[PDB]
């Protein structure tokens, strides 16, 4: 701590599309959060303990393009809204939070870390409300604790009038569950 | 290219730090005074000058990016020195915080003007002065970010 983040783009529309079909990505990977994209929407995928997890709502059941072609998902849990592939070669993994901190920091796709107060297992209030447009694209992003440990993965925004007051997330425990789950 | 939120400045007499917050490049009056800042289009004057709070500010220079004020009330601060060292500090209140590990005043020299960050990397305050018992800085005075917001 303090939690600081930065973003780096690595592909544009045409490279992404070609890569989406060919399913072969030869670029180098770095970081613990990958800005991921399909032919329809773009979001994030967080690497926690050797596995690149993301929101099933975005990745669906797709494969991840890699240097050795497409990689099938390791886990898929439609109910918990999770999917995970082995973390790409080069990524760095976060580790689950072992301190039960009630103060969480959400990392957005623009590499911003905004504070949120854990309101209950899979919900937390934004200390400073933001437009829903600000959170768009940030699904599957990490919800960190003061020490930089994975508490959850951003899932949906709790908003009204187009302004987000809170956020729903997938508690890291559901991850350990999904893995143990026959899915 | 990459942009910095913290500029390392100099006035011949001394070197210290400035921190861009809310589009303004803030630093301590005891370093800059009412001096103007250098620019490739000539010197630019202070947008804000406040001797009473030891605060002066010019419009953020080039190659910089503004820092976001803190909104979590966290008291576990982090001080960034002119050498890019992060010194964790415990907030004792408003404008004072105690280092978790005291260090020779030298280690904090030239860092006045730099930021006091919270666990989200947001600006909590501006490092104003080091409080040192016998050459060992154990605490630091700082300008809370609200003063800057109130000065704007």
């Amino acid at each position: 701590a303090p939690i600081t983040a930065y973003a780096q783009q690595t592909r544009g529309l045409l490279g992404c599309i070609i890569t989406s079909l060919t399913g072969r990505d030869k670029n180098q990977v770095e970081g613990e959060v990958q800005i991921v994209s399909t032919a329809t929407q773009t979001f994030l995928a967080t690497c926690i303990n050797g596995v690149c997890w993301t929101v099933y709502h975005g990745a669906g059941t797709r494969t991840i393009a890699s240097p050795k072609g497409p990689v099938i998902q390791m886990y898929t849990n439609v109910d918990q809204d999770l999917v995970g592939w082995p973390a790409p070669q080069g990524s760095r993994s976060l580790t689950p939070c072992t301190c039960g901190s009630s103060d969480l920091y959400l990392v957005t796709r623009h590499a911003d870390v905004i504070p949120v107060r854990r309101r209950g297992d899979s919900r937390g209030s934004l200390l400073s409300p933001r437009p829903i447009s600000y959170l768009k694209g940030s699904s599957g992003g990490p919800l960190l604790c003061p020490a930089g440990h994975a508490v959850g993965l951003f899932r949906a925004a709790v908003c009204t009038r187009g302004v987000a007051k809170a956020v729903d997330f997938i508690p890291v425990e559901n991850l350990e569950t999904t893995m143990r789950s026959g899915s | 290219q990459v942009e910095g939120e913290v500029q390392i400045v100099s006035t011949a007499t001394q070197t210290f730090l400035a921190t861009c917050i809310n589009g303004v490049c803030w630093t301590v009056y005891h370093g800059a005074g009412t001096r103007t800042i250098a620019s490739p289009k000539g010197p630019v004057i202070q947008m804000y000058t406040n001797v009473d709070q030891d605060l002066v500010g010019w419009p953020a220079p080039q190659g910089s990016r503004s820092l976001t004020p803190c909104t979590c009330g966290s008291s576990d601060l982090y001080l960034v020195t002119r050498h890019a060292d992060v010194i964790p500090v415990r907030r004792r209140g408003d404008s004072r915080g105690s280092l978790l590990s005291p260090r020779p005043i030298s280690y904090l020299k030239g860092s006045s003007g730099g930021p006091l960050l919270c666990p989200a990397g947001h600006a909590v305050g501006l490092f104003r002065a080091a409080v040192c018992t016998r050459g060992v800085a154990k605490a630091v005075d700082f300008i809370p970010v609200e003063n800057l917001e109130t000065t704007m």
Binding site: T4, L21, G23, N27, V36, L44, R62, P142 | -
Partner: peptide, 23 residues
């Protein structure tokens, strides 16, 4: 057929404050 999810960027948390090199 559904295309592969492609990595088009990254966010790095491991970075620490640093003096931006010159040149």
């Amino acid at each position: 057929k559904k295309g592969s999810v492609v990595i088009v960027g990254r966010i790095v948390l491991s970075g620490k404050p640093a003096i931006i090199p010159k040149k």
